[PDB]
Scaffold this active site. Structure first.
Site, PDB file in Angstrom:
ATOM      1  N   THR D  34       0.825  -1.204   0.000  1.00 17.57           N
ATOM      2  CA  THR D  34       0.000   0.000   0.000  1.00 17.57           C
ATOM      3  C   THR D  34       0.861   1.256   0.000  1.00 17.57           C
ATOM      4  O   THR D  34       1.735   1.427   0.855  1.00 17.57           O
ATOM      5  CB  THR D  34      -0.929   0.002   1.214  1.00 17.57           C
ATOM      6  OG1 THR D  34      -0.169  -0.211   2.410  1.00 17.57           O
ATOM      7  CG2 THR D  34      -1.977  -1.089   1.081  1.00 17.57           C
ATOM      8  N   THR D  35       0.608   2.139  -0.965  1.00 20.91           N
ATOM      9  CA  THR D  35       1.379   3.370  -1.072  1.00 20.91           C
ATOM     10  C   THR D  35       1.241   4.195   0.202  1.00 20.91           C
ATOM     11  O   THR D  35       0.130   4.492   0.651  1.00 20.91           O
ATOM     12  CB  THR D  35       0.912   4.184  -2.280  1.00 20.91           C
ATOM     13  OG1 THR D  35       0.887   3.348  -3.444  1.00 20.91           O
ATOM     14  CG2 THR D  35       1.842   5.366  -2.527  1.00 20.91           C
TER      15      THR D  35
END
Lengths: 231, 220, 234, 226, 55, 176, 52, 233, 247, 142, 229
Positions: D34-35
């Site tokens: 997840t960024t």
């Protein structure tokens, strides 16, 4: 075969896994210089920080190992920090056991013997770093000892390390009152060898004096560069 | 799937134990015959004769072997130590079933790690329980399996000698005299001599290399 | 193909970072039979479709009890389910003996998470390959935790694990608005759970032998209903 | 060459180029996560991430390791959980010993040493997580990103995960614009993520030097800015 | 490694690190009732026999 | 009882003497002689141990142990049991094969070395025999004068054996 | 099952007592069966000793 | 299958131990002969050169005890490890029973030691085979050999190392068990002279010992040369 | 994990591969040599340096093991250093602490050989990639010189050489050795052999040489125990070596 | 964080406490023949009136090591003692040698005992159970 | 391993049935001792040498159990030799003091060695006392043994800052003579060792040294035999 994965001999008699641990030491492009004055030892390293986001305050490859010993590491920072903690604990243990401050060359010998362990146990990888210890010994005076992943070590009048270490070494061979002059000398020769006019933050500098080892702050490197630019 | 003790073959075999049984199949042949009153065991020029493959483990119980000699000697030494340890901790001499169970346990124990080789030896254990006169004969195997036999053969020619015994033994007319057991043993060996006779109350005799039985059976 | 090279242990990543050996243990849950769990604010309910190996055999015990406050549901490897259940119940006990406090359900779940993570990183062992649903009631009310043998724990209103759990979980996703309000009327929550587990059935129907239920709540210690006790809810 | 066949199937192997391909593969594991971003203020630091039956007040990605120091990780959930818990143990032991919040550089050192130790032996694998952590400190505030190699540095901003490249580019433009208040940095973090949202911050002026979640009114204002 | 680490990671004071103590107090299952040759407590002193005689 | 009794060693020119009141309490390990007083169990254990050690020495070195090296071996072997020592009073006597130097030494329970050049006594009646040896002894006795001196001193200490040791020969004698 | 007619069927022992009211029949690698039966017997006797 | 000593092959044979056996086929020949009144030991010094100190290279014949000696073929490092273990065992036996160790008990202990290294996987077999000459008052003069496999056998005369087959054939033709030690010395020298790969059996290429009468002698090169010229080599 | 398989094993030829490869690593190492005289022993080697900035005074290839015993090596210097440390420790522990005197050269060589051999059995370590020339004096065995190989085999030599020049050095020694050399003759022959074996600059700073000789009471560091013996091992200074080279 | 070894007495005693030396006939009592201690006569009850020093001198080095690991945990964190211990266990577990009494050359380096002697070095100090096979079985746990 | 306890209970059951001085001076230190040795009231050996050497320039003398002082002194001399070889440096006296006191501390005073350690090293001259429990103190002059009080009385009466080598040797030998005369345990000769910071240590054995034979055939030979070996 197994000689590729573990540090056993190949038919050539070569420990390929140690030679490959030497090549790990140049995976960072930093190069560095150490020189001896009459009564001080100076170590110059590049500080390559092109990444705008990276905070150059934290990016140091020079470690203060003892009151009187410092070392610069060439090679990946995780293994450098590991070696630093190891050497620092060993210097403290030596002081505790023998009642006097560990000599730079005895610490180098200890770390080289540890590296020999890592070159001889099948299940321990070599550490992948080159360690340059600098000190002013109370018997030998200013001295420089450099330790390889192979567990070889020797004393030096001066050293360079990293991809361009031949250029600096040859410049030093061409060459061959206070530590500020020695710092300025070493910086000037780094500039002359590498061809880069350093910014105040392109460098980090360590000085061992008779009493202590310390690293220069950016304002001290700034004033050293200014004193160079006066000439 | 061949190269560890830990690995089952897809068909459920542990090949590394079958290879130890193949190692047994190469050892020099040992024969054993129970009578009603005895058990009979049997099997270069410059050899120094004065310095038998049948090894007493205690005065009442005897172990023969086939396969690797050094392994056999280690397992014999351990069996002797256990016999004397039992005789010390408990007043009674070991049961022959207790001894063969211990030997098979030791052979199994050396099968319970891939870092140790199993003993490439099968043993033939013969004797009588203390204060008893039922003859007991047992085989142990590299797996630490053990079984009781009226007669058995192990090693290089065990196939043919066993196929002979399977027809010259009778489960309900067993040899009823010491000379009859020795005769059957020598006959089985002559299909391919050393003979040992164990008798109740700790009586064991290596049978003097009496060729008389050999000559008689060659006449027959 | 190339997966064959990088899947031999929990200690090799692939060139894509997959860590296949953990993925295979997460697929090991899909071989398990379906179980559903759900809770309201006052009560928590587990529902499980048991199986038997043959018509001559009894049904396997799929739900357990840590203590009088919390309990557990199994899907996946029986040996690992045994290990984790013994572990969760030895922690529930030690907690009671040393502090005389009911182990918080969330804490118990975190302890399972920690235990499960170790096997994902050392060479010699293997991941536990078993999913667990934990329910309990404590000072913080009713709890439902889903444990995955990767070492992941989530607190949920409802979930399902096992071969066709996707059906029951889709059904619950449509209806969570209804069951979470079912406070003080646990019979309707049990019947909602049995309805949810009536999806994901295949060639089979719920019966007093194959169906098992348990419940816990503010007024209700952890009780298991199985056999003729389940006929009230089928 | 990115694969390194013949030097990759075991940890601690150096390839002929001195690369530890298992470490590069653990880095490649981070590139899937997840960024997540962090931003360093004048006064503090702020963290943000891009992220139905889950209990929503329990579904939280930013981990407070201590009131002193906030932590966010990307990559393998169980590895992240383990490293987080090890850091929380190290912080708690430091606090028990020295009766002071763990200096962010000392904590960073301890975590780097713990991760790095997992690169030494074939019996263990590197952590598949890169962690951004930071907080207010005796010496100010510090932001670190700890790679699965165990390499770590201080940062003015860092991003990890699948969107890390664009997040890095925009956070670098942001740094070029401000060669930040906690409010402004919160707004810019929300923007960078938008370029569900969850934010937390630590500043001497606006969280008393504790780590606290950015929630409710200010979160909605940041979403309005985004 | 992790097992080694967890050795360095409140239970020391009441000695519920000690496995035989956990067993004796029936923390680690009923294993105290699963052993032949029941284990007997001895006082941790330089002269246990004197303490016994002093009964 | 066969525990205890007395051993004495004494130096001459190019010779040494060692004597005891007697089971036996004088042992030899090649050309080095060890006399041991004390508990006969400990005397026997020391004899077995020093036989073991000097046999291994001779096998590894292809050379008989010299009396000075055997003295250091005895010292170190006694100190090994620093706690619960052997209740023994050993005495070593011999001549170095290379230099011909006559050598005697004696020990405490834990291997302090006297290495006195004149004479050494141990065990029961030690102070009586110290007085006798001091009075009778003179330096540089001839081998037969040394025999008379040692044997008379021993007889006046309170059935005895005497060894007269040359470089190349040893004479064993008995006394009533 | 008998490998040969010389094997004494009266000593194959594929069924064993574990306890006065519990028996066990083996199949498979008999050495492992022996180990399990010894364990089961020890468990049974211990449970008798400790719980009467 | 041959990668490690703990793996049986499908043929049921331990290739690693057969390779340890084959290692001795490259060691210079040792020979031992038991006579009515003593035992002869002899060995070829195959590693030889003029810069080697032949006068102090005692390098194949080692006494383990009085009344016992060993001849070594194979790895000298392993040889001296086993020799020192056997010396310690013999001295422990003398210390315990106050009697000289029987030769067969020592041979058995050493063969059990050599066997164990074939059975644990972190150990290789010792690449060495000993001939044991000794005397005890149970069996008198007796002579043994042992292999890397850790089996042993008693022999009246035996040869080990490279050309063992040839030497053993010459022994089988020429040996007779009523010969004297002085006869066995010459039979040993003849056998080695016909067996050696050297152009001539020069005294420096030999090591020689006898156990007889009980006394044992390891010959210094002078008397080796004299015994050679007396034999006529 | 309770076991580790043996890293050194026999090949089907009966040859232990790792031992052959350690002997190859020895063959690759720089030349060293030693020579027994009637009244001493010489050991000498090249101080090959990776740079002229290295301090040759720290390239101690020759090291004292006992006042009467010294060692030199070819091959992996770190292995030699660890072996020297262990050999000194064992010389004290096994012998000086038991018998009150330093071991004879034969027994210290045997101890080093034992240490080196066991690395050939272990499944955790490779063998040492060095061979050592150990020269010493004993009161009874006199002057002695041993060569220890990676296998832990050792033999006494009159003269020998190891490393790259080993064969040509051994031939030069075999033609030039004789049973009547004095220590100054042995030193001259050693220097000529190394001059013939060395590569590039041959000077007193690219060589080091030690001798076992008579006692040096000026190296004993104390006076007044007349039976006490100065060290017989003596390293030559580069000044003295240069004064030899001017011969 | 101890100087003198504190925990130095067995808290519990049983006839079965000593494993690897148990009677096969009755797995509850020692094997006094395999013990080779001079019979049962060294009964475990005779572990009384021990020398006051012995219980501290046997385990002095262990206590020093534990203090050192504790100091490294306090100052450097859990990583450093973990690394040290893992290295040490790797060395201990890979050095198998049933014939040598001598300590491993690398173990001394890790312990920093390369230039140290103690009486355990100077003084490193059987018809049954001394065999190489007993050591194999102890080490593999056969 | 280590010092065995294996007859402690046995020997319990069976039991139920010197002057030394150090004198620091302007460029060095002098240590001196008497050479009497006694067992009980009996002089076991005159001319016993009590000055031990730890290193060429580190010397030692001890009181208490003689075997203990000898064993610990030779162990620490071995450790100092090995450490000097490892570090390629002349050993420090503070290093000997440290390892000696840590050794004596390990044995909690059960190794009853009390010592004066004197030496010179690259950092100057040093003089220390060590007690069997492992406690140390530095001094400019020290005395030890039963005559320690008489020797300290002399040192305190005559010691002064910046003694010369000769004046320091005179003072030390006077203090040992006062011990010899005033203590019964001390006697016979005076041993001196002189260490100067720039110089080889000068050992001075016996620096100060303050018929009845029967006719042949007297003794009744019983019998004779030849023993050969």
């Amino acid at each position: 075969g197994y000689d590729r994965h573990i540090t056993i001999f190949s038919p050539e008699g070569r420990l390929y896994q140690v030679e490959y641990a030497f090549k790990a030491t140049n995976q960072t492009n930093i190069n560095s210089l150490a020189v001896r004055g009459k009564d001080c030892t100076v170590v110059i390293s590049q500080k390559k920080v092109p990444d705008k986001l990276l905070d150059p305050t934290t990016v140091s490859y020079i470690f203060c190992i003892s009151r009187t010993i410092g070392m610069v590491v060439n090679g990946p920072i995780p293994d450098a920090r590991n070696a630093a903690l190891r050497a620092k604990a060993e210097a403290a243990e030596f002081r505790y056991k023998y009642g006097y401050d560990m000599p730079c060359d005895v610490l180098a010998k200890r770390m080289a013997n540890l590296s020999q362990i890592y070159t001889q146990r099948a299940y321990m990888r070599p550490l992948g770093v080159i360690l340059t210890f600098v000190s002013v010994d109370e018997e030998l005076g200013p001295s420089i000892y450099k330790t390889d992943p192979a567990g070889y070590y020797v004393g030096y009048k001066a050293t360079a390390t990293g991809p361009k270490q031949q250029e600096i070494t040859t410049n030093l061979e061409n060459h061959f009152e206070s530590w500020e002059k020695v710092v300025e000398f070493a910086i000037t020769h780094m500039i002359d060898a590498l061809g880069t006019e350093f910014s105040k933050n392109d460098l980090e500098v360590g000085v061992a004096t008779k009493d202590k080892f310390f690293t220069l702050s950016a304002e001290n490197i700034e004033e050293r560069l200014v004193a160079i630019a006066e000439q | 799937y061949d190269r560890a003790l830990s690995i089952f073959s897809p068909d459920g075999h542990i090949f590394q134990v079958e290879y130890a049984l193949e190692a047994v199949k190469r050892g020099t042949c040992a024969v054993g015959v129970k009578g009603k009153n005895c058990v009979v065991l049997g099997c270069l020029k410059l050899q120094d004769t004065r310095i038998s493959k049948v090894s007493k483990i205690d005065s009442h119980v005897v172990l023969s072997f086939s396969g690797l000699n050094a392994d056999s000697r280690i397992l014999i030494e351990k069996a002797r130590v256990e016999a004397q340890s039992h005789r010390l901790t408990l007043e009674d001499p070991v049961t022959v079933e207790y001894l063969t169970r211990y030997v098979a346990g030791v052979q199994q124990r050396y099968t319970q790690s891939g870092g140790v080789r199993p003993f490439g030896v099968s043993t033939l254990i013969a004797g009588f329980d203390p204060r008893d006169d039922e003859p007991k004969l047992y085989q142990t195997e590299p797996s630490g399996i053990y079984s009781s036999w009226s007669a058995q053969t192990i090693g290089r020619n065990s196939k043919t000698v066993r196929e002979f015994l399977e027809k010259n033994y009778d489960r309900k007319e067993p040899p009823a005299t010491v000379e009859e057991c020795v005769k059957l043993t020598v006959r089985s060996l002559l299909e391919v001599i050393e003979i040992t006779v164990v008798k109740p109350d700790s009586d064991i005799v290596a049978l003097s290399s009496e060729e008389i039985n050999q000559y008689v059976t060659q006449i027959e | 193909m190339f997966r064959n090279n990088y899947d031999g242990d929990t200690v090799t990543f692939s060139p894509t970072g997959r860590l296949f050996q953990v993925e295979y243990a997460l697929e090991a849950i899909k071989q398990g039979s379906v179980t559903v769990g759900l809770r309201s604010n006052t009560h928590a309910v587990l529902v499980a479709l048991k199986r038997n190996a043959d018509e001559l055999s009894s049904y396997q015990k799929k739900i357990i009890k840590c203590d009088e406050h919390m309990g557990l549901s199994l899907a996946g490897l029986a040996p690992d389910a045994r290990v984790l259940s013994n572990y969760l119940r030895q922690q529930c006990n030690y907690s009671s003996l040393v502090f005389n406090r009911k182990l918080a359900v969330e804490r118990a779940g975190h302890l399972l998470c920690d235990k499960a993570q170790k096997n994902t990183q050392s060479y010699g062992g293997r991941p536990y390959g078993v999913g667990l649903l934990i329910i309990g009631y404590d000072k913080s009310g009713a709890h439902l935790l889903e444990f995955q043998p990767s070492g992941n724990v989530t607190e949920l209103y409802g979930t399902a694990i096992g071969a066709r759990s996707q059906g029951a979980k889709t059904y619950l996703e449509r209806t969570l608005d209804t069951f979470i309000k079912i406070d003080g009327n646990p019979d309707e929550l049990i019947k909602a759970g049995v309805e949810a587990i009536s999806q994901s059935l295949r060639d089979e129907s719920l019966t007093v032998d194959n169906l098992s239920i348990a419940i816990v709540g503010k007024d209700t210690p952890f009780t298991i209903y199985d056999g003729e006790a389940v006929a009230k809810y089928i | 060459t990115s694969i390194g066949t013949g030097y990759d199937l075991s940890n601690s192997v150096f390839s002929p180029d001195g690369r530890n391909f298992q470490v590069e593969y653990a880095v490649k594991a981070v590139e899937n996560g997840t960024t997540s971003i962090g931003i360093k203020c004048n006064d503090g630091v702020v963290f943000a991430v891009e992220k139905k039956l889950l209990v929503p007040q329990k579904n939280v990605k930013i981990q407070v390791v201590d009131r002193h120091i906030g932590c966010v990780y990307s990559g393998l959930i169980p590895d992240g959980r383990h490293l987080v818990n090890r850091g929380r143990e190290e912080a708690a032991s430091f606090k028990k010993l020295y009766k002071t919040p763990i200096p962010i550089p000392a904590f960073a050192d301890r975590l780097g040493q713990y991760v790095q130790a997992h690169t030494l032996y074939n019996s263990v694998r590197p952590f598949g997580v890169s962690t951004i952590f930071g907080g207010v400190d005796k010496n100010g505030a510090h932001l670190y990103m700890l790679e699965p190699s165990g390499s770590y540095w201080g940062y003015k901003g860092a991003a990890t995960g699948k969107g890390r490249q664009s997040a890095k580019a925009e956070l670098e433009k942001l740094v070029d614009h401000h060669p930040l208040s906690a409010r402004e940095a919160v707004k810019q973090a929300a923007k960078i993520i938008y370029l569900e949202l969850e934010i937390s911050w630590c500043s001497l002026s606006e969280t008393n030097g504790l780590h606290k979640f950015v929630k409710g009114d200010l979160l909605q204002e940041a979403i309005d800015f985004a | 490694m992790q097992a080694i680490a967890d050795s360095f990671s409140l239970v020391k004071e009441l000695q519920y690190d000690n496995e035989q103590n956990l067993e004796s107090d029936f923390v680690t299952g009923a294993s105290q009732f699963q052993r032949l040759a029941p284990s007997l407590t001895v006082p941790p002193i330089a002269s246990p026999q004197q303490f016994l005689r002093a009964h | 009882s066969i525990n205890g009794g007395i051993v004495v060693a004494m130096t001459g020119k190019d010779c040494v003497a060692i004597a005891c009141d007697l089971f036996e309490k004088i042992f030899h390990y090649g050309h080095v002689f060890l006399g041991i007083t004390g508990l006969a169990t400990d005397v026997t254990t020391l004899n077995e141990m020093f036989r073991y050690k000097t046999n291994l020495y001779k096998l590894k070195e292809e050379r008989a142990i010299e009396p000075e090296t055997f003295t250091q071996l005895v010292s170190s072997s006694l100190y090994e049991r620093r706690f619960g020592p052997y209740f023994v009073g050993p005495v070593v006597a011999g001549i170095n094969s290379k230099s011909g130097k006559p050598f005697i030494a004696g020990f405490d329970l834990i291997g302090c070395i006297d290495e006195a050049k004149d004479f050494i006594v141990s065990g029961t009646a030690s102070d009586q025999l110290f007085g006798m040896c001091e009075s009778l002894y003179e330096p540089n006795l001839e081998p037969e004068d040394l025999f008379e001196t040692i044997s008379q001193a021993l007889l006046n200490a309170a059935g005895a054996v005497v060894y007269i040791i040359k470089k190349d020969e040893v004479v064993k004698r008995y006394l009533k | 099952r008998a490998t040969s007619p010389l094997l004494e069927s009266d000593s194959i022992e594929k069924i064993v007592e574990i306890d006065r009211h519990i028996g066990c029949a083996m199949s498979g690698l008999t050495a492992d069966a022996r180990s399990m039966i010894e364990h089961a017997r020890t468990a049974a006797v211990t449970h008798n000793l400790y719980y009467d | 299958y041959d990668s490690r000593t703990t793996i049986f092959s499908p043929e049921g044979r331990l290739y690693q131990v057969e390779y340890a056996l084959e290692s001795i086929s490259h060691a210079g020949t040792a020979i031992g002969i038991m006579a009515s009144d003593g035992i002869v030991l002899a060995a070829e010094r195959k590693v030889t050169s003029t810069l080697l100190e032949q006068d102090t290279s005692t390098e194949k014949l080692y006494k383990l005890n009085d009344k016992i000696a060993v001849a070594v073929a194979g790895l000298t490092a392993d040889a001296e490890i086993l020799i020192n273990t056997a010396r310690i065992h013999a001295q422990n036996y003398l210390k315990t029973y106050n009697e000289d160790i029987p030769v067969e008990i020592l041979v058995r202990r050493l063969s059990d030691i050599k066997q164990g290294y074939t059975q644990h996987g972190g150990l290789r077999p010792f690449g060495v085979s000993f001939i044991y000459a000794g005397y005890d008052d149970r069996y008198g003069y007796q002579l043994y050999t042992s292999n890397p496999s850790g089996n042993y056998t008693g022999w009246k005369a035996i040869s080990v190392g490279a050309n063992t087959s040839a030497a053993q054939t010459l022994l089988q033709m020429d040996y007779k068990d009523d010969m004297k030690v002085d006869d066995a010395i010459e039979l040993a020298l003849k056998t080695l002279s016909k067996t050696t790969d050297s152009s001539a059996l020069t005294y420096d290429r030999l090591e020689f010992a006898t156990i007889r009468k009980v006394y044992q002698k390891i010959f210094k090169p002078q008397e080796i040369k004299d015994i050679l010229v007396k034999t006529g080599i | 994990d309770r076991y580790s398989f043996s890293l050194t094993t026999f090949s089907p030829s009966g040859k232990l591969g790792q031992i052959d490869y350690a002997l190859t690593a020895v063959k690759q190492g720089v030349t060293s040599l030693g020579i027994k005289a009637t009244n001493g022993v010489v050991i000498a080697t090249e101080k090959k340096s990776s740079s002229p900035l290295a301090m040759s005074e720290t390239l101690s290839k020759v090291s004292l093991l006992t006042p009467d015993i010294g060692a030199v090596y070819s091959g992996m210097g770190p292995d030699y250093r660890v072996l020297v440390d262990k050999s000194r420790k064992v010389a004290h522990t096994s012998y000086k602490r038991i018998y009150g005197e330093y071991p004879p050269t034969k027994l210290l060589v045997s101890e080093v050989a034992k240490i080196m051999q066991e690395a050939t059995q272990s499944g955790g370590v490779r063998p040492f990639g060095v061979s050592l020339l150990i020269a010493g004096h004993d009161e009874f065995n006199g002057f002695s010189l041993y060569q220890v190989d990676p296998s832990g085999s050792y033999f006494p030599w009159k003269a020998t050489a190891i490393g790259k020049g080993s064969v040509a050095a051994k031939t030069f020694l075999e033609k030039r050795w004789n049973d009547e050399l004095e220590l100054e003759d042995a030193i001259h022959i050693a220097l000529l052999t190394l001059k013939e074996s060395v590569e590039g600059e041959f000077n007193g700073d690219t060589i080091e040489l030690a001798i076992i000789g008579d006692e040096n009471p000026d190296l004993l560091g104390y006076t007044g125990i007349p039976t006490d013996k100065g060290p017989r091992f003596r390293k030559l200074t580069s000044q003295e070596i240069n004064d030899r080279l001017e011969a | 964080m101890n100087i003198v070894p504190q925990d130095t007495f067995k808290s519990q005693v049983s006839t079965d406490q000593d494993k690897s030396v148990l009677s096969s006939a009755v797995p509850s009592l020692p094997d006094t023949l395999r013990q080779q201690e001079g019979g049962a006569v060294p009964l475990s009850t005779q572990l009384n009136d021990r020398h006051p020093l012995e219980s501290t001198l046997k385990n002095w080095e262990t206590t020093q090591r534990q203090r050192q690991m504790e100091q490294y945990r306090q100052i450097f964190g859990i990583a450093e003692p973990m690394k040290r211990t893992m290295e040490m266990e790797i060395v201990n577990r890979t050095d198998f040698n049933p014939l040598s009494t001598n300590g491993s050359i690398h173990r001394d380096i890790l312990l920093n005992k390369e230039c140290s002697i103690d009486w355990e070095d100077v003084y490193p100090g059987t018809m049954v159970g001394d065999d190489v096979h007993s050591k194999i079985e102890k080490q593999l746990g056969i | 391993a280590g010092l065995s306890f294996d007859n402690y209970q046995r020997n319990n059951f069976l039991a139920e049935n010197t002057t030394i001085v150090g004198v620091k001076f302007n460029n060095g230190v002098v240590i001196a001792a008497d050479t009497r040795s006694t067992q009980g009231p009996i002089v076991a050996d005159k001319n016993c040498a009590k000055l031990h050497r730890i290193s060429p320039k580190i010397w030692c003398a001890g009181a208490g159990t003689a075997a203990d002082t000898e064993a610990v002194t030779q162990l620490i001399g071995s450790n100092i030799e090995l450490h000097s070889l490892y570090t390629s440096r002349e050993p420090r006296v503070v290093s000997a003091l440290q390892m000696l006191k840590q050794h004596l501390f390990k044995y909690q005073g059960h190794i009853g060695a009390y010592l004066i350690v004197a030496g010179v090293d690259p950092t100057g001259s040093h003089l220390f006392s060590i007690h069997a429990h492992g406690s140390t103190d530095v001094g400019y002059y020290l005395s030890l043994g039963s005559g320690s009080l008489a020797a300290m009385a002399v040192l305190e009466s005559h010691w002064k800052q910046d003694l010369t080598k000769e004046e320091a040797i005179k003072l030390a030998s006077d203090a040992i003579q006062a011990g010899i005369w005033n203590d019964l345990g001390s006697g016979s000769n005076v041993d001196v060792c002189v260490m100067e910071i720039g110089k080889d240590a000068e050992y001075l054995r016996n620096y100060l040294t303050p018929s009845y034979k029967f006719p042949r055939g007297t003794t009744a030979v019983l019998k004779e035999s030849i023993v050969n070996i």
